[PDB]
Structures are given as structure tokens and as C-alpha cells.
Design a protein around this ligand. Sequence first.
Ligand SMILES: [Cl-]
Length: 298
Amino acid sequence: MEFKLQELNLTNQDTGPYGITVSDKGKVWITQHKANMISCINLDGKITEYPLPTPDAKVMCLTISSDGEVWFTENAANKIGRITKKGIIKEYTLPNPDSAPYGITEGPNGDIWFTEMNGNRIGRITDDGKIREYELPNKGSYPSFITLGSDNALWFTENQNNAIGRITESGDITEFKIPTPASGPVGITKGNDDALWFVEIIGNKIGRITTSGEITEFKIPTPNARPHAITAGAGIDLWFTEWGANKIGRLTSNNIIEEYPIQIKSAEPHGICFDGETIWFAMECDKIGKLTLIKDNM
Ligand SMILES: [Cl-]
């Protein structure tokens, strides 16, 4: 699989596209941290803007819930946002000041779970807007990305505790120290192999952790790649952003890592998602990238 890369333009330039996800019907949703908005791109390529109600909110991550609503984090404004199916945005303020919400995902029973990077907590909010939080055991852990595991627990990275965290719906928190010292785990996601796969921004590795906590690691070919986010592709593929190297990485068959250069000065790729055919990513340079592999012959 060699490839095709297309860039798409958002409604404005320099909007700071950052998080990205795709609905089951193929609509791409993005956060734009400089423009302070969320955008949806339909299949026909038409863009709908959702400007945040709160100015200077530093919108970071987003997720689409089972009921089709879009939930997101406002990192600077200390808020969780929600876009209803009616297009209406509702914001909920976190109880403790300067909690710095960051990663967000749906839990096993439908609540929305998130990390509070500076607050040093995991939060959970119900459909009715009730917020509940779990303090992490060690100060200054900087919990970052979060995802739902195959074991129905939430798995997250602790960027400054060099650990992968697991929290269950009942509040059991377990931490698994990473073997590479001070490795700076950032993105995490569920692999199709039912393990969790993460990136080490400093360790410069892709990590794999089983639901029982067994870790293996794979060195990224490009030095100082500063990998950020990761997502499952088809089968055992994991696709990741090399924010520092301006590349898209792919861990594939036999754990070979392939790298695809993005052909754009200071691209700074951040979020990444896969819609089944196309790998979509957000670049700080202000465009959305679409990467597609060409099938093999004979
Ligand atoms: Cl839940």
C-alpha cells in the first residue's frame, strides 16, 4: 500500500484544527482551537460551523456519543460541551477551577468520560448533566487521552507519571508504569486486536498494552517524531500522527512501521481517525488531510 494524500480547506484559514472524529455515516467532525469552533464536513464536502458560546475556550478533543451528539472539551474555559441533534450547544462548567479538561470518550453504559489534565482527575458526566470526578492517586500525573477498552474499562495516558491508567465504572483505578523511562504517553486508542495502543512523545515509540496490563513497545523509525495521536485502521493496523516530524505513521503487518511524509511546511498533524477507507487528520497548518492506500495487485 503506497498512497494518495489530499488536503481540504476549512471555511477560514489558521483556525487551528486539532481533534477529529468521523460519524458512522461518514461525516467528519473537528475542533478548531484558534477559531474557537467545531466544524462538520458532510459527504458532499459542505462545512457547517458551530462557534462555541464561550470565547477563548481552547477546544481540544471531541467524541460522538451513541445518540449522535457531539461532546467536547474546553481546556482553557474549564468546561465540557455538547452539541445536541438539534444543533444546540450546551456547556457544563467543571466544579474545580482550572481543571483543564482534555481527552473525552463514551463509557460502557453511555456516560461521557474525560481527563482533567491539570485537575489530576477523571470526570464522568451523565445525559442529565451530573458530574462526578475521581482523583488520581499521584499528584501531577497529567492524564491526557482516554478511550474505552475491550474490557469495558476506560484507559488513559498519564503524560507526566509515565503510566497507562485504567478506570472502571465502579471507580477502580489501576496504573501500569511504562518500561521506557519518562516516555510521555499521549494518544491512546483501542486496537482491533483488543489491546490498547498508545504513543510516547519522548520515548519515540508505539506502545501496546493488553487489558491485563502487559506492555510491549515498537520504536518509531524517525527520530524526534513527537507522535501525538493514534487510531485503529483496518485489521491490526494502527495509524498515528508524527506532529514533530510532519508525517503520518502506520504500524502494520509484522509490526513494521511505515511513514508517509506530509508535503506541507509545518503541517503539525494532531488528531487522526479512520472511516473504514480513508485516514483523516487535522493539521495545525490549518487544513484537514485525507490519506488513502491503494490496494495491491497479483
Ligand atoms: Cl459509562
